[PDB]
Amino acid sequence: EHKTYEADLFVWCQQQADGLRALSRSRRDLPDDLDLEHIAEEIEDMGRSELREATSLVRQICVRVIMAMSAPEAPDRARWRSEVVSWHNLLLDTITPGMIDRIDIGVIWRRAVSEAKAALIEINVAPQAGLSFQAPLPADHFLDEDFDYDATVARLGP
Amino acid sequence: EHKTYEADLFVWCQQQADGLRALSRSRRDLPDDLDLEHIAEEIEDMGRSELREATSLVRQICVRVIMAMSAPEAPDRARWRSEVVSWHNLLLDTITPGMIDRIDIGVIWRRAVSEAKAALIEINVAPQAGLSFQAPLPADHFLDEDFDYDATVARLGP
């Protein structure tokens, strides 16, 4: 189904790149200086970049969730929570319905554990003893408009 | 003059956005689901983003130049120089001939001085007494493939 620019930017990038190529490869009377092939490549790549950004924001949220699981009384948690709210709001502006299935929590959570362990060593905190590289919650949990940092930390303890 | 994607990405973005709009606004028989207006907006914006990136890299280089002017014997200079080489190589991959005139050293150097002063306070170094918000060198100096950090620092002392 066709998606508008506004309704689903991610799907629009792929549909528009495909449409540009279809037009370019069919018509023999378009202006030669109009570079539909590289335009399509750039539009397609912008879609990929949106997904990379959403993926990164979920990762960063997960790192702070894991850090609070390891240091649940850290005074730093107030800052971590503020960061998470900021990232999550940006995530809600970036995700689209067609992008949801592409958010790979299995890969993201693994990378978040590796990153969180390094960051914990830096602040001289030992990681959760039970800390697992296996995602405990689906991607949807973090994409939820009502995602709650402190509730998530509490449910993933102790 | 028409510029290819490879020859000048920055000029290509503007020429292609203009060409997309010209085509869209003239033909009555293009596919309705092909969104040439928003494609043109995105392509145009990518051009702007390239210039923003180049501008940022020149700024970051200037900050490290100013920091070494204030702390010319700092052991940290080796790291600063390494950072500058990395940023400068990325800058050389980003700049294009049509973008050169848009690199505004008067604005960039001012912002670099403000940033450098804050960063110097953090490392407990007083700024150059003669440190000026007025750019002492043209944008071209930093865009030069043969830009030399240490030579620049030395010429801007003492």
- Whether A58 and A140 have beta carbons less than 8 Å apart is answered as no
Tally A–B CB contacts below 8 A: 48
Does the bond joining B138 to the residue before it have cis omega, within 30 degrees of 0?
no
Considering only CB atoms, B39 lies closest to which of A2, A16, A33, namely A16
Say how many C-beta atoms besides its own lie within 10 A of residue B133's C-beta: 12
The C-alpha angle with vertex B155 and arms to B152 and B158, in degrees rounded to 5, equals: 120
Is A23 close to B15, i.e. CB distance below 8 A? no
- Whether A17 and A45 have beta carbons less than 8 Å apart is answered as no
Resolution reached, in Å?
1.5
- Whether A88 and A147 have beta carbons less than 8 Å apart is answered as yes
Interface probe, candidates B42, B43, B45, chain A, greatest A C-beta count within 10 A? B42
Question: CB-based burial of residue B76 (10 Å sphere; 0-12 exposed, 13-18 middle, 19+ buried)?
Answer: middle
Q: Which residue from B114, B16, B34, A40 is spatially nearest to B8, judged by alpha carbons?
A: B16
Using CA of residue A136, residue A139, residue A144, residue A148, what is the dihedral sign? positive
For residue B80, CA distances in Å to A64, A148, B67, B77 come to: 30, 40, 9, 5
Using CA atoms, how far apart are residues A91 and A144, in angstroms rounded to an integer?
10
B23 — contact with chain A (CB < 8 Å)?
Answer: yes
For residue A17, CA distances in Å to A14, A42, B45, B113, B117 come to: 5, 8, 17, 43, 46
Interface probe, candidates A13, A35, A41, A49, chain B, greatest B C-beta count within 10 A? A35
B45 — contact with chain A (CB < 8 Å)?
Answer: no
- φ, ψ (nearest 5 deg) of residue A96: -135, 165
Using CA atoms, how far apart are residues B65 and B84, in angstroms rounded to an integer?
9
Method: X-ray
Say how many C-beta atoms besides its own lie within 10 A of residue B53's C-beta: 15
Q: What is the DSSP string of B69-113?
A: HHSTT-TTHHHHHHHHHHHHHHHHHH--TTTGGG--HHHHHHHHH
Q: Which CATH number fits domain A1-158: 3.40.1410.10, 1.20.1220.20, 3.40.50.1100, 1.10.1140.10?
A: 1.20.1220.20
